[PDB]
Structure 1
Amino acid sequence: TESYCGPCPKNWICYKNNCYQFFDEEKNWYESQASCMSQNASLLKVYSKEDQDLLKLVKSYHWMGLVHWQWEDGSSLSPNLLTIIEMQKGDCALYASSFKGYIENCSTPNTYICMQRTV
């Protein structure tokens, strides 16, 4: 039924023990990556439809940590998680609902989602 969520920094949003923050500033992919890292975090990593099911409600497009495909940490993209759609020619990806990755020019300013997990 109920549970606690964490551990997370207190100004981060907690969902199924992952910590998220949304940034409304539009930045290119590298600036966004650096922004998350400066907060002991990374860009959004999509690893579970079940544990990240609220990603189905995302409004708009946001940078996630997927680059040309693998994640920031060097982990590969798991196969049955994202439908990858070409939007602009590019080497980075935007997350958008529902479980889509939209290929985007890495220089294009976009909002972004940061994520932390303490397993």
Structure 2
Amino acid sequence: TESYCGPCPKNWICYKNNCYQFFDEEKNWYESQASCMSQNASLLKVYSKEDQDLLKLVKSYHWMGLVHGSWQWEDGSSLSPNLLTIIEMQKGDCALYASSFKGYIENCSTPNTYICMQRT
């Protein structure tokens, strides 16, 4: 059964109506967030293991929009339970995504590659 996906800009991957773009130039969390904002987007937000099962295929670790009450996303929403295994890697208030559905606590100032996400 075929269906259309998006909408998304042309250079973004579309999957279950979310749009993803990988950035390989390393930036700290704040610079990564600013980069995504300049593309009318945000850093990766993880909300569903089903809608976002493609994240099982992501290799290496990349900034997502999770920051430190509890951890929260850029949009102010809380991290849903039973989505990510949080592991402590560095003293930090930001998190990297790693497969499969892990979040590494990371110094916000450390340069990393990053994933932007859009949903119209």
TM exceeds 0.5?
Answer: yes
Q: CA deviation at 1:40?
A: 0.4
Runs of 4 or more consecutive aligned structure 1 residues displaced over 4 Å after TM superposition: none
Cα RMSD after superposing both structures: 0.5
Q: CA offsets, 1:41-90, max 9 Å, x none? A: 00000000000001011100000000000000101000110000001110
Q: TM-score, normalised by structure 1?
A: 0.98
Moved more, 26-35 or 2-11: 2-11
Which secondary structure state, in structure 2, belongs to the residue aligned with residue 81 of structure 1?
coil
Task: Give the structure 2 partner of residue 117 of structure 1.
Answer: 119
Matched, 1:54 2:57: no
Percent identity, aligned pairs only, is 100
**Aligned partners of 1:79 and 1:60: how far apart in 2?**
23
**Aligned partners of 1:31 and 1:6: how far apart in 2?**
26
Equivalent position to 1:84, from 83, 86, 89:
86
**Aligned partners of 1:47 and 1:112: how far apart in 2?**
17
Q: CA deviation at 1:13?
A: 1.1
Q: CA deviation at 1:20?
A: 0.6
Gapped runs of 5+ residues in structure 1? Answer: none
Q: CA deviation at 1:17?
A: 0.5
Which secondary structure state, in structure 2, belongs to the residue aligned with residue 30 of structure 1?
helix
Moved more, 10-19 or 66-75: 10-19
Q: TM-score, normalised by structure 2?
A: 0.97
Gapped runs of 5+ residues in structure 2? Answer: none
Q: CA deviation at 1:103?
A: 0.2
The alignment of Structure 1 onto Structure 2 pairs a total of residues equal to: 118
